[PDB]
Ligand binder design. Sequence first.
Ligand SMILES: *[C@@H]1O[C@H](CO)[C@@H](O[C@@H]2O[C@H](CO)[C@@H](O[C@@H]3O[C@H](CO[C@H]4O[C@H](CO)[C@@H](O)[C@H](O)[C@@H]4O[C@@H]4O[C@H](CO)[C@@H](O)[C@H](O)[C@H]4NC(C)=O)[C@@H](O)[C@H](O[C@H]4O[C@H](CO)[C@@H](O)[C@H](O)[C@@H]4O)[C@@H]3O)[C@H](O)[C@H]2NC(C)=O)[C@H](O)[C@H]1NC(C)=O
Ligand SMILES: *[C@@H]1O[C@H](CO)[C@@H](O[C@@H]2O[C@H](CO)[C@@H](O)[C@H](O)[C@H]2NC(C)=O)[C@H](O)[C@H]1NC(C)=O
Ligand SMILES: *[C@H]1O[C@H](CO)[C@@H](O[C@@H]2O[C@H](CO)[C@@H](O)[C@H](O)[C@H]2NC(C)=O)[C@H](O)[C@H]1NC(C)=O
Lengths: 339, 36
Amino acid sequence: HPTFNKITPNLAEFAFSLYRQLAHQSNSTNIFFSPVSIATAFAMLSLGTKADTHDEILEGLNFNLTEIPEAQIHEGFQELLRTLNQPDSQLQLTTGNGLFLSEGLKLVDKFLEDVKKLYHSEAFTVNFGDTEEAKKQINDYVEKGTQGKIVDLVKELDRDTVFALVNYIFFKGKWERPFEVKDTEEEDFHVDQVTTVKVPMMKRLGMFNIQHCKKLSSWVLLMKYLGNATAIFFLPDEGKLQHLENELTHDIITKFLENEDRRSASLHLPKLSITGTYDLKSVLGQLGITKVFSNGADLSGVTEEAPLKLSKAVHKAVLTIDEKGTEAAGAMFLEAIPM
Amino acid sequence: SIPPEVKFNKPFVFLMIEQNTKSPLFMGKVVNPTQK
Ligand SMILES: *[C@@H]1O[C@H](CO)[C@@H](O[C@@H]2O[C@H](CO)[C@@H](O[C@@H]3O[C@H](CO[C@H]4O[C@H](CO)[C@@H](O)[C@H](O)[C@@H]4O[C@@H]4O[C@H](CO)[C@@H](O)[C@H](O)[C@H]4NC(C)=O)[C@@H](O)[C@H](O[C@H]4O[C@H](CO)[C@@H](O)[C@H](O)[C@@H]4O)[C@@H]3O)[C@H](O)[C@H]2NC(C)=O)[C@H](O)[C@H]1NC(C)=O
Ligand SMILES: *[C@@H]1O[C@H](CO)[C@@H](O[C@@H]2O[C@H](CO)[C@@H](O)[C@H](O)[C@H]2NC(C)=O)[C@H](O)[C@H]1NC(C)=O
Ligand SMILES: *[C@H]1O[C@H](CO)[C@@H](O[C@@H]2O[C@H](CO)[C@@H](O)[C@H](O)[C@H]2NC(C)=O)[C@H](O)[C@H]1NC(C)=O
């Protein structure tokens, strides 16, 4: 019956596909994103797009237009968002879509009720002639929404900004099988072949959802949060890291996700704080999303007054995992200007 | 060792999923925890 799982795949793949790009960049640095956050923003962006430029969005997100109709995509997206923004009693998970428009712009009323209904978006009128106050006004939304966890999303706002699209996501959960804190104890992590960093290592010995697949060449752990979520970790065999990344596929994940078999082991894993803060532009370029970002962009969907364009597509996420669960957050920032 | 010892003492990828929808909430690779 449902809509999500009709798209869930396409997300999945996209995400992996996206990841593989980020990997190519540095082999030397943490990576964290929210494939959702990035993705819904571009989707409700595409709402106001026509021809080649709309097509490369939807498509670049791994959607195959012949196979699945346009209008269904959003119907999809509509659902996924609803579903997420339900109250899990034990788990807390939220997202939000915001539009911030300059006072002068007259929009295509359609497009407006479109984002208002399908992506349940929120609408704000601003003056982009007070760049520092506009800049604030946004950074609070994201601060409010991600409850403080992301606070400097927009570092430089362009003086001629005609509008911005923003979306956030916030995640706070707890393990089922939470670590005991008496246990946590500093060990080595072997980053590189010559770099060794001392880390707080949390520990339990007990019955875990863990296994090893010679396919992936890895160990795999699944770690349920209380509620409708789960963490998966993949420890690649020595030398097999790049392999691991290449093999990963959504249907493979789903296999793991059906399995509920426990095995006993002695588990050691770090406690973590990283962030990722990205300029998505070249990256979605590789993924063949060029035209919006260019002088060939078509956003007649949004307004008739002038030819706009995407100048900045900027994402940042933060994650913290400890003995008691995880808190994690992301947001996407999109700015449009005239030619 | 018995039970066998599995240590995440090296770069590893992971990700989060929401069960209902199976959608990929966040995805990461941890190369150095101390770089923040
Ligand atoms: C990200 O990807 C990287 C690959 O792009 C991965 O890193 C690469 O990993 C190997 C790992 O062993 C490193 O090589 C080590 O070099 C040590 C000696 O260094 C000198 O000699 C080597 C060549 O022999 C050279 O690479 C060094 O840069 C340095 O010499 C320079 O060489 C150039 C070219 O001739 C010359 O012009 C310069 O004058 C010269 N000198 C200087 C000062 O610049 C060795 O001692 C190491 O040996 C150990 O490890 C081996 C692998 O297991 C093992 O077989 C040995 O027995 C021994 O234990 C080692 O050979 C690479 O430098 C490094 N980078 C590159 C670009 O190749 C990286 O791991 C990865 N990171 C991730 C995934 O997180
Ligand atoms: C929609 O998806 C299908 C399946 O991936 C694509 O069709 C296949 O594409 C490859 C590469 O062009 C061909 O070698 C196969 O012969 C295609 N299969 C069939 C049954 O024709 C298809 O290209 C996608 N749609 C569009 C418009 O690109
Ligand atoms: C995770 O999501 C499920 C749905 O898969 C939630 O369960 C529904 O909750 C409402 C009350 O909030 C009930 O009326 C429904 O009957 C429940 N089931 C279904 C199939 O809709 C659930 O609350 C969530 N969290 C937890 C902890 O279970």
